RNA sequence: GCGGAUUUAGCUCAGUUGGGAGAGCGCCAGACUGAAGAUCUGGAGGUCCUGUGUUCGAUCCACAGAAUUCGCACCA
């Protein structure tokens, strides 16, 4: 009950399952959601649909906090990425700006077994 | 009505339409005597309640066969509704033929039984795989 | 000996507006699958420790008894 009114909408999109974490201008997450939090096991969570439900719920939960506008920050590729976005464009919030803050590293990290 | 003309054919075994229409119209007669409603109106509603909307098909997509939900066409819903009503009628235990149809058309409006179990089973298979909804087709 | 806790359908347990006996698992069947599995649905399954009393009616109150468990007490 801090009525943030405006904040940021982090979208951790991945091939495993997208996870949304709404926050304020500072960066303190007010609430989050994920396909797993929606009830999905682990294989169906990656679906773009499980991303829409996670985006809307993560949003609605924030509606309670009193937030109206948010800034989406997309990270990492994967199904449900664009789905989570449009899911946010709707709901009860106003997407003021979208940004692809996907890290995509430079040079000094040994890739995992799957990547090597 | 063409619907009634189509329903009398599925009850026509060995080409005896004269006797077929005899049991049909005799059912609508006893149907109005048992229920205070027009035989025609009580007939249509009976076929409307027995119709699926989304059917799940099996498809090999790369590795295994996934179940993808798909919409049904209006031409098959009429056939199934007609077929499942006559089969359920021949399942009743009343000797009178016209009576098996009259009661079935009534219970079909009340909704409950095996035909309903299959309706729920299919409705359950659907939505259960909502994770495959994006494949509307 | 004494006190506390516990004593519901096979198992594990919920159940105090006293007036519905119920859930999970299990068992059987159905659906599904080539089929088996898993999941979903359905059914069966209860002297609800025992007796008596209290009320119009008690699993759900009182009293008495029994069993389980625990602390304590006893132990040339």
Helix, strand, or coil (residue B69): strand
Q: Long-range contacts: B11-16, Cβ < 8 Å, 24+?
A: B11/B86, B11/B101
No. of helices (H) and no. of strands (E), chain A? 2, 5
Cα angle for residues A11, A82, A114 (degrees, 5° grid): 70
Query: CB < 7 Å to strand C — which of 20-39 in chain B?
Result: none
Contact A39, A64 (CB under 8 A): no
Query: How distant is C1' of C67 from CA of A38, in Å?
Result: 48
Cα angle for residues A49, A101, A45 (degrees, 5° grid): 20
Cα separation, A81 vs A12, whole angstroms: 8
E strand or H helix that includes residue A87: helix A81-89
Distance from CA of B110 to the nearest CA of A (A): 35
Q: What is the CA radius of gyration of chain B?
A: 18
For this PDB entry, the determination method is cryo-EM
Question: What are the φ and ψ backbone dihedral angles of B66, each rounded to 5 degrees?
Answer: -95, 150
Q: Which residues are within 8 A (CB) of A9 and not within 5 positions of it... i.e. 6 or more apart?
A: A20, A21, A22, A23, A59, A70, A71, A72, A73, A88, A93, A95
Resolution in A: 15.0
Nucleotide nearest to B65 (CA to C1'): C33
Residue of A nearest to B133 (CA): A49
Contact A83, A52 (CB under 8 A): yes
Torsion of CA B124, B125, B129, B135, to 10 degrees: -120
C strand bases under 7 Å from protein CB: 30-32, 40-41
Output DSSP code: residue A85: H
Distance from CA of A47 to the nearest CA of B (A): 6
The two tokens of residue A49 are 């649909």
Nucleotide nearest to B125 (CA to C1'): C40
Contact A44, A35 (CB under 8 A): yes
Q: How many CB atoms lie within 10 A of CB B58?
A: 9
Cα separation, A62 vs A65, whole angstroms: 5
DSSP A12-55: E--SS--EEEEEESS--EEEEEETTTTT--SSSTTSHHHHHHHH
Query: How distant is C1' of C38 from CA of A94, in Å?
Result: 43
Q: Provide the terminal-to-terminal Cα distance of chain A, rounded to the nearest Å.
A: 47
Give the strand pairing for B65-71 and B54-60: antiparallel
Strand C and B121 CB separated by under 7 Å: yes
The two tokens of residue A35 are 């396909």
The two tokens of residue B50 are 């027995």
Cα separation, B24 vs B5, whole angstroms: 10
The sheet carrying A94-100 orders its strands as A29-34, A19-24, A6-12, A69-75, A94-100
Q: How many CB atoms lie within 10 A of CB A4?
A: 20
Could you tell me which of A68, A67, A63, A69 has the C-alpha nearest to residue A98? A69
């Amino acid at each position: 009950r801090k009525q943030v009114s405006d904040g940021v909408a982090h979208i951790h999109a991945s091939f495993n399952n997208t996870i949304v974490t709404i926050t304020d201008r500072q960066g303190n997450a007010l609430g989050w959601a994920t396909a797993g939090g929606s009830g999905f096991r682990g294989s169906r969570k990656s679906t773009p649909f499980a991303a829409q439900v996670a985006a809307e719920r993560c949003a609605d939960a924030v509606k309670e906090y009193g937030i109206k506008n948010l800034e989406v920050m997309v990270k990492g590729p994967g199904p449900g990425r664009e789905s989570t976005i449009r899911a946010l464009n709707a709901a009860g919030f106003r997407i003021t700006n979208i940004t692809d803050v996907t890290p995509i590293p430079h040079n000094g990290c040994r890739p995992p077994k799957k990547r090597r | 009505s063409e619907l009634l003309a189509k329903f009398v054919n599925i009850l026509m075994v060995d080409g005896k339409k004269s006797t077929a229409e005899s049991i049909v119209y005799s059912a609508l007669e006893t149907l109005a005597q048992r229920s205070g409603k027009s035989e025609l109106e009580a007939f249509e509603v009976a076929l409307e309640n027995v119709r699926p909307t989304v059917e799940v098909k099996s498809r090999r997509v790369g590795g295994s066969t996934y179940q993808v939900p798909v919409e049904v066409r209006p031409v098959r819903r009429n056939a199934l509704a007609m077929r499942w009503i006559v089969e359920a009628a021949r399942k009743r235990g009343d000797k009178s033929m016209a009576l098996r149809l009259a009661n079935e058309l009534s219970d079909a409006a009340e909704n409950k039984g095996t035909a309903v179990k299959k309706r729920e089973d299919v409705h359950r298979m659907a939505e259960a795989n909502k994770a495959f909804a994006h494949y509307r087709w």
